[PDB]
Amino acid sequence: MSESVPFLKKPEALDSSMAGYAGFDPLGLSSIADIKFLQESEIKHCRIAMLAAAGSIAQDIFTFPGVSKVVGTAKMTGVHDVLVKQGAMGQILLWTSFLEVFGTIALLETLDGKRAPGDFKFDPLGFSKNAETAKRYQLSEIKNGRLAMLATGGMVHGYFITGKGPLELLTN
Amino acid sequence: RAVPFAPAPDCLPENIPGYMGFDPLGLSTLCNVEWLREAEIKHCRVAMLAAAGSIAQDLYQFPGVEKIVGSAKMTGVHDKILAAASTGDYKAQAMSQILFWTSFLEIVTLPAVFETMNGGPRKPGVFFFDPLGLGKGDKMGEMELKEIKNGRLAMIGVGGMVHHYLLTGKGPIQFLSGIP
Amino acid sequence: FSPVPSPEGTKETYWETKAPSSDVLGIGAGVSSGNFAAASVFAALVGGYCTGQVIPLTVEPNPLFLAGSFLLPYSWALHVAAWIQKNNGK
Numbered sequence: 001m002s003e004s005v006p007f008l009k010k011p012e013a014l015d016s017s018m019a020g021y022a023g024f025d026p027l028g029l030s031s032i033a034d035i036k037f038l039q040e041s042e043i044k045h046c047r048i049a050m051l052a053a054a055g056s057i058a059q060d061i062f063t064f065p066g067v068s069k070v071v072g073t074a075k076m077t078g079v080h081d082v083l084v085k086q087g088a089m090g091q092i093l094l095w096t097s098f099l100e101v102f103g104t105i106a107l108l109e110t111l112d113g114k115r116a117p118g119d120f121k122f123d124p125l126g127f128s129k130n131a132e133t134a135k136r137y138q139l140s141e142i143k144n145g146r147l148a149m150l151a152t153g154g155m156v157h158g159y160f161i162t163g164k165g166p167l168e169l170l171t172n
Numbered sequence: 173r174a175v176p177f178a179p180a181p182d183c184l185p186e187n188i189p190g191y192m193g194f195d196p197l198g199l200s201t202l203c204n205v206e207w208l209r210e211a212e213i214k215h216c217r218v219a220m221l222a223a224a225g226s227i228a229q230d231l232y233q234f235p236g237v238e239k240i241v242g243s244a245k246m247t248g249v250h251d252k253i254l255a256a257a258s259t260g261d262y263k264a265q266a267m268s269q270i271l272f273w274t275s276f277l278e279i280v281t282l283p284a285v286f287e288t289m290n291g292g293p294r295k296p297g298v299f300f301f302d303p304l305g306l307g308k309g310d311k312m313g314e315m316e317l318k319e320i321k322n323g324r325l326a327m328i329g330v331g332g333m334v335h336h337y338l339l340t341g342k343g344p345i346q347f348l349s350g351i352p
Numbered sequence: 353f354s355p356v357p358s359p360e361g362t363k364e365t366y367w368e369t370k371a372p373s374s375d376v377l378g379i380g381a382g383v384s385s386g387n388f389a390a391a392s393v394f395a396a397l398v399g400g401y402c403t404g405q406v407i408p409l410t411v412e413p414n415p416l417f418l419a420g421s422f423l424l425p426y427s428w429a430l431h432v433a434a435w436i437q438k439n440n441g442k
């Protein structure tokens with residue numbers, strides 16, 4: 001049985017060792033696709049979403065000097081349209097795409113099994129040398145990223161309905 | 173055996189819960205017993221929600237529904253809510269939310285029925301949803317067959333409540349109160 | 353006349369049994385027969401609904417209904433996989 005869902009059987013592909021394991025896969029999507037690929041994708045989705053949710057709140061709180069002229073009133077998805085016309089979105093796309101090309105090489109190494117998924121050995125300031133703290137930090141990353149994925153969807157849909165943006169909608 | 177005139181089908185196990193041996197037409201032979209049991213339990217739960225909803229709707233209404241719904245209605249309520257959703261009102265999107273969440277639950281409980289049919293450890297009908305623990309805790313009482321008896325009553329009861337208000341304008345509490 | 357190459361991961365799929373080995377399902381080799389059968393019906397109903405909603409085609413078709421209409425042929429392959437898995441005991 002599964003720790004998350006008692007009635008259903010435990011997912012065969014998933015194992016306890018992997019971080020953020022709740023034994024949750026009712027539709028058994030893990031069997032269909034390689035688990036290492038799914039782990040790498042989940043981590044990537046989590047980190048992009050985490051940046052997105054923090055950015056969504058930040059744009060409400062403060063805006064960088066001179067941005068206000070270019071973005072008249074649009075927030076969230078609306079700002080992208082104007083900055084797409086201007087050069088901001090394209091320049092971000094270009095540099096992220098350059099990063100992703102190396103990420104493609106990294107993904108190949110993870111799929112072959114040689115490299116652990118989601119690890120780019122990026123620790124500029126040491127936070128995970130304990131080897132006990134590391135696992136706790138990894139679980140924190142998974143849970144915070146999952147919350148941010150749900151949050152990013154939640155906020156953008158509120159913008160679709162009213163155009164308020166995350167903080168303004170809470171005020172009114 | 174409820175009816176001695178028509179025997180109980182052998183395929184129906186005596187041990188399984190809720191068995192009165194009332195299968196005069198022997199429909200159990202035609203279909204898988206485990207699937208039939210699951211269909212029964214699921215039907216009882218959906219019917220039980222529908223019949224109480226009929227009674228409660230007359231006695232209490234949530235604030236502000238009175239504008240979006242006729243004062244007394246049953247299936248008319250569903251049609252009224254849908255009419256405003258198709259119209260484009262933001263507020264009357266109740267039907268989509270109920271449909272979406274029930275559908276999502278059905279989608280993620282989908283493997284359970286097939287897994288039991290393959291002899292899986294879970295028995296039919298037990299999703300292990302007892303947070304309070306009081307009703308099904310330890311030995312338990314006759315509540316296991318109580319759900320089945322109340323559910324069967326709910327099924328026919330819903331049929332009665334829905335069929336009335338089709339030929340009449342009266343609602344459940346109103347029709348019980350005055351009978352013409 | 354010389355060894356004919358095949359991609360890595362090529363396995364033998366010739367069958368003379370009642371149903372082919374589950375390997376012929378590729379990435380879907382581990383999915384249950386119930387899960388293909390429910391996906392088969394789901395894809396058939398959703399695909400038929402989406403197809404029906406755009407039968408008079410306009411210059412503005414809903415792209416979700418176009419994409420959802422591809423579920424109808426995909427459901428055929430799903431019920432074939434459901435028969436294969438049911439006859440392999442999955």
Ligand code: CLA
Nearest residue numbers: 048051052054055058059062063064067071079080088122
């Ligand atoms: C998915 C993430 C995401 C996306 C698509 C956007 C997109 C956008 N933002 Mg938002 N933003 C984000 C995250 C994001 N932001 C984050 C994380 C913050 C800080 C909490 C902000 C704070 C912010 C402000 C204050 C403003 C924008 C603005 C804008 C727009 C113009 C581009 C710009 O100047 O951004 C500039 C954004 C930054 C400089 C913040 C980036 C900081 C993150 C943390 C990058 C970290 C990189 C990391 C250190 C390296 C990791 C390497 C590793 C992968 C190996 C554009 C629509 C502007 C706008 O139009 O507002 C209405 C604006 O004024 N952003």
Ligand code: CLA
Nearest residue numbers: 218221222224225228229232233234237241249250253266
């Ligand atoms: C099949 C069942 C069913 C259906 C389709 C409807 C449909 C509707 N009802 Mg009715 N209703 C139901 C059951 C049902 N109700 C039940 C069980 C009750 C409580 C006894 C009510 C009480 C009720 C009131 C008081 C009102 C409606 C109203 C409405 C309309 C707007 C939606 C709304 O506010 O509902 C609100 C419904 C609820 C809050 C009931 C939710 C009860 C939940 C399902 C119990 C869950 C218990 C358990 C913890 C869940 C287990 C989960 C497990 C499966 C995993 C809509 C036509 C409104 C209307 O316009 O009427 C004129 C209105 O004012 N309903």
Ligand code: CLA
Nearest residue numbers: 217220221224227228298299300301307308315316319322
């Ligand atoms: C008469 C109603 C009734 C009864 C006796 C039961 C009894 C049972 N159910 Mg079922 N069930 C029902 C309705 C009922 N259910 C409905 C409507 C739903 C859908 C929301 C479910 C969904 C459900 C699931 C998903 C599961 C069960 C399970 C169980 C069992 C263990 C938990 C327990 O002790 O529940 C005790 C429950 C009650 C005593 C119901 C109390 C309801 C109150 C007291 C009265 C009704 C209030 C209602 C809102 C309307 C009020 C009046 C209105 C007209 C104004 C038990 C056999 C679990 C099981 O078999 O595995 C452990 C399980 O997994 N049930």
Ligand code: KC2
Nearest residue numbers: 325327328329330331332333334335336337339340351352
């Ligand atoms: C086909 C589905 C169907 C079901 C499952 C069903 C179940 C129940 C239950 C079970 C919970 C009870 C307790 C009950 C009671 C009454 N039913 Mg019945 N009933 C159904 C159908 C009809 C029709 C078509 C009519 C009708 C009637 C009455 C009257 C008479 C009052 C009167 O004489 O006015 C009473 C007391 C007639 C009526 O509505 O008259 C306008 C009439 O037209 N019923 N009914």
Ligand SMILES: CC1=C(C#C/C(C)=C/C=C/C(C)=C/C=C/C=C(C)/C=C/C=C(\C)C#CC2=C(C)C[C@@H](O)CC2(C)C)C(C)(C)C[C@H](O)C1
Nearest residue numbers: 050051053054123124144147148151154155158165166169
């Ligand atoms: C230091 C450094 C590192 C780093 C790093 C970084 C940049 C780490 C950043 C991590 C971040 C950005 C985490 C942010 C998570 C956001 C969440 C969980 C959202 C919650 C919102 C909710 C629940 C909501 C909501 C809302 C709804 C939906 C609708 C609204 O109308 C209302 C409302 C607002 C209530 C790394 C690890 C790379 C390496 C090294 O160590 C150096």
Ligand SMILES: CC1=C(C#C/C(C)=C/C=C/C(C)=C/C=C/C=C(C)/C=C/C=C(\C)C#CC2=C(C)C[C@@H](O)CC2(C)C)C(C)(C)C[C@H](O)C1
Nearest residue numbers: 220221223224302303325326329332333336343344347348
């Ligand atoms: C499972 C469980 C949980 C739960 C739960 C829930 C939601 C439990 C709900 C149970 C319910 C809602 C039971 C309702 C049954 C309705 C019946 C029998 C009506 C029959 C109508 C008739 C006979 C009629 C009529 C007539 C009249 C009046 C009107 C006329 O116009 C028509 C007509 C003449 C035919 C909880 C949360 C406790 C946790 C727990 O751990 C597990």
Ligand SMILES: CC1=C(C#C/C(C)=C/C=C/C(C)=C/C=C/C=C(C)/C=C/C=C(C)/C=C/C2=C(C)CCCC2(C)C)C(C)(C)C[C@H](O)C1
Nearest residue numbers: 052076077078079080081149150151152153154156157276
């Ligand atoms: C379009 C467009 C753009 C854009 C954009 C963006 C940012 C689009 C992003 C859209 C996103 C992130 C949608 C996510 C939706 C999440 C869902 C539906 C999950 C719900 C949870 C469920 C169902 C169940 C949850 C669950 C519960 C309740 C109980 C069970 C357990 C659990 C699973 C936790 C731009 C930027 C180009 C601008 C342009 O001008 C327009």
Ligand SMILES: CC1=C(C#C/C(C)=C/C=C/C(C)=C/C=C/C=C(C)/C=C/C=C(C)/C=C/C2=C(C)CCCC2(C)C)C(C)(C)C[C@H](O)C1
Nearest residue numbers: 194222246247248250251327328329330331332334335338
């Ligand atoms: C909202 C929506 C709709 C809808 C709808 C709904 C909710 C429709 C529901 C329809 C139902 C439940 C019909 C069943 C009627 C007959 C019954 C229950 C007889 C039971 C007893 C029997 C067979 C005998 C029992 C027995 C007795 C006598 C005792 C002996 C033993 C035994 C032989 C077992 C519409 C249609 C209004 C349209 C609208 O646009 C959208």
